[PDB]
């Protein structure tokens, strides 16, 4: 799960890492009042949304008057910010971070992720701050420096120094950088982060390192032991259907298309989406039933998939699971009736009572086709959205 920039900075402060003086404000009045608590302008006002690219979307401004701060908060609070990293619906802005302006001398990049190839937390740094780090990796790989945290020893100062010297830092900036590495590495491990990105990690004109931005991602699998992080979840930043699906033990991810997909299995779900795509279809979503495709659960699945108006058909692909194919069919039938599923539904059942479940579907009289195999199921859902 993602954290807001202001929350990332609070965490940094809690670990003695440096970030600008700032306040997260929920009302224009709070935002304007923060100006004086911060001091002499100008002030940086930033919409707090999980997505990046806020700057290019107008969500980050340097203003010099309390009236400008207020105008900005008024403009954004309760409005959705669309950036190149959100869908066209954007993310709601419920907090404006008002912080002190920072005199930037140089912009660096410092970040960390779990590198799956080397199976290590890898920190990476670059003199190329203020740029999409991927861009820099593409073009100037030789400018990206990395160190892998050794699980046996924990992060070591020499690794922080190594990056600091590759970045050509010198003097107090080396110790400051080392300190930042050790703290971010420590936070990474103690808080079970999946990702850290300080872009930019700034060298100020006054000669100090400061985290100008912060993007933290927590390992959701570890939230059971990160109570602080757990409370920081901002559900407004994501499609609310995902959390709805999750509390129903469904993994849902909204896509662009019009063919809803309800499948048990993440791999099967993606493969089903791909096969629908392969047969001229446009998957509207990823929905992995995982949990026992019970009647209640399948019903929720339909409710969630159908909350998207673009959905013109629903392909249900169930291979195995804990429920027998005929019980799954009874639930798909109950779901279609009780949800008032007004779209055609194509079902591919495999496992015990597969044909009997198919028969039950065919005999319900509801617009539910029991397909014969996967290719067939794909062609039929594809054909079922023709014209719609």
């Amino acid at each position: 799960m993602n954290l807001h920039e202001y929350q990332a900075k609070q965490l940094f402060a809690r670990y003695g890492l440096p970030a600008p003086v700032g306040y997260a404000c929920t009302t224009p009045r709070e935002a304007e009042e923060a100006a004086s608590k911060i001091g002499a302008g100008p002030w940086v006002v930033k919409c707090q949304v999980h997505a990046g690219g806020r700057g290019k979307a107008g969500g980050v401004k340097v203003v010099n008057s309390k009236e400008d701060i207020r105008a900005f908060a008024e403009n954004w609070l309760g409005k959705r910010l669309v950036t190149y990293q959100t869908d066209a619906n954007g993310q709601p802005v419920n907090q404006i971070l008002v912080e002190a302006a920072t005199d930037i001398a140089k912009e660096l990049y410092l970040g960390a992720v779990v590198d799956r190839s080397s199976r290590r937390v890898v920190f990476m740094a670059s003199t190329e701050g203020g740029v999409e780090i991927e861009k820099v990796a593409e073009e100037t790989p030789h400018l990206i420096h990395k160190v892998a945290l050794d699980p046996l020893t924990g992060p070591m100062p020499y690794q922080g120094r190594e990056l600091a010297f590759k970045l050509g830092l010198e003097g107090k900036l080396v110790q400051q950088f080392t300190k930042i590495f050790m703290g971010l590495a420590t936070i990474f491990l103690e808080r079970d982060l999946a990702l850290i990105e300080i872009n930019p990690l700034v060298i100020t004109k006054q000669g100090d390192l400061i985290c100008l931005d912060g993007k933290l991602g927590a390992d959701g699998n570890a939230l059971f032991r990160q109570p602080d992080l757990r409370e920081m979840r901002d559900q407004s930043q994501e499609d609310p259907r995902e959390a709805q699906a999750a509390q129903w033990e469904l993994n849902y991810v909204a896509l662009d298309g019009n063919i809803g997909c309800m499948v048990n299995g993440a791999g099967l779900a993606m493969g089903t989406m791909d096969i629908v795509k392969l047969h001229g279809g446009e998957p509207a979503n990823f929905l992995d039933v995982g949990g026992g495709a019970t009647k209640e659960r399948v019903t929720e699945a339909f409710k969630i998939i159908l909350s998207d108006d673009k959905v013109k058909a629903v392909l249900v692909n169930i291979f195995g699971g804990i429920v027998r194919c005929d019980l799954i069919a009874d639930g798909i039938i109950g779901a279609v009736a009780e949800v008032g599923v007004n779209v055609p539904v194509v079902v591919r059942l495999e496992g015990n009572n597969a044909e009997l479940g198919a028969k039950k579907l065919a005999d319900s009289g509801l617009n539910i086709i029991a397909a014969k195999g996967l290719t067939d199921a794909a062609q039929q859902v594809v054909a079922a959205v023709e014209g719609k």
Binding site: R119, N221, F224, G267, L268, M270, D274, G290, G320, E350
Partner: protein
């Protein structure tokens, strides 16, 4: 076959729990030599007609089991896995989903140093059709055969199982390496076992988005795998930077797309199939 066979003695950690019980019943019905289970606190009792032990070391001393299947909730897995490694278990099949990536990061290092093989986590398990079933896969769709299957996905594996059983090829051993970002074993590890296994004549490698295990497996196959390999990668239509169910099904930093994996496999000589429904056909071709 690889990893397990008719002689593999297996203990179950989290044996008395719901899934541990249910799936051990299935393994037991299949003929898997389950010899016992471990549930701290219930040692000295019997469950499914087998002895339950308070620790894996007691279980191993008592039964000689060399493999452990784990059905322990995520919060306790690292502890369960390290306990198994410490008790001398050589093969750990971890079914559990939700294990913190950092826990697996440490476990993977321990596994490699202790020389212990782990399949999983977030895995459907391992099955050598006709000989040994450890995991949650439905055993009736399998057929003792010659196709070795490795996959980051349970359900997709079943599809490949159905197909290879339907074309009569059958399966030597099916290995679900799991959908986590840092699995205990990767494609390369399992591919190497299939190459060295006489019973396996062809390999179906099933991957998906995220990480680079498939791309590395490709490079590995080109240079060290002589048997024919049919590949399938799910997620061509998955968005980037979004978890698609599996913790490991996420394209991080724009790297690890399905297409890149198909491409890397194709370039290594792997017979790739764009539709998961054509795995059997492609095997027929290369067989």
């Amino acid at each position: 076959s690889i990893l397990i066979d008719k002689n593999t003695k297996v203990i179950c950690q989290g044996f008395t729990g719901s899934q541990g019980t249910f799936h051990s019943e299935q393994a037991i019905a299949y003929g898997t030599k389950m010899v016992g289970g471990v549930t701290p606190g219930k040692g000295g009792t019997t469950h499914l007609g087998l002895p339950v032990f308070n620790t894996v070391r007691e279980a191993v001393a008592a039964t000689g089991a060399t493999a452990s299947v784990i059905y322990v909730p995520a919060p306790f897995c690292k502890d369960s896995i390290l306990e198994a490694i410490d008790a001398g278990i050589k093969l750990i099949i971890t079914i559990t989903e939700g294990i913190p990536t950092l826990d697996m990061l440490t476990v993977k290092v321990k596994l490699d140093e202790a020389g212990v093989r782990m399949i999983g986590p977030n895995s459907p398990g391992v099955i050598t059709p006709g000989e040994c079933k450890i995991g949650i896969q439905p055993g009736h769709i399998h057929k003792p055969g010659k196709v070795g299957i490795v996959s980051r996905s349970g359900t997709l594996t079943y599809e490949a199982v159905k197909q290879t059983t339907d074309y009569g090829f059958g399966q030597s051993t099916c290995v679900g390496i799991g959908g986590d970002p840092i699995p205990g074993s990767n494609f390369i590890d399992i591919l190497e076992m299939f190459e060295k296994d006489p019973q396996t004549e062809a390999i179906v490698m099933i991957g998906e988005i995220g990480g680079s295990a498939e791309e590395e497996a490709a490079a590995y196959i080109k240079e060290h795998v002589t048997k024919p390999v049919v590949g399938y990668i799910a997620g061509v239509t998955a968005p980037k930077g979004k978890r698609m169910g599996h913790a490991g099904a996420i394209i991080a930093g724009g790297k690890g797309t399905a297409d890149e994996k198909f491409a890397a496999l194709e370039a290594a000589g792997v017979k790739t199939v764009r539709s998961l429904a054509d795995i059997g056909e492609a095997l027929k071709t290369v067989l």
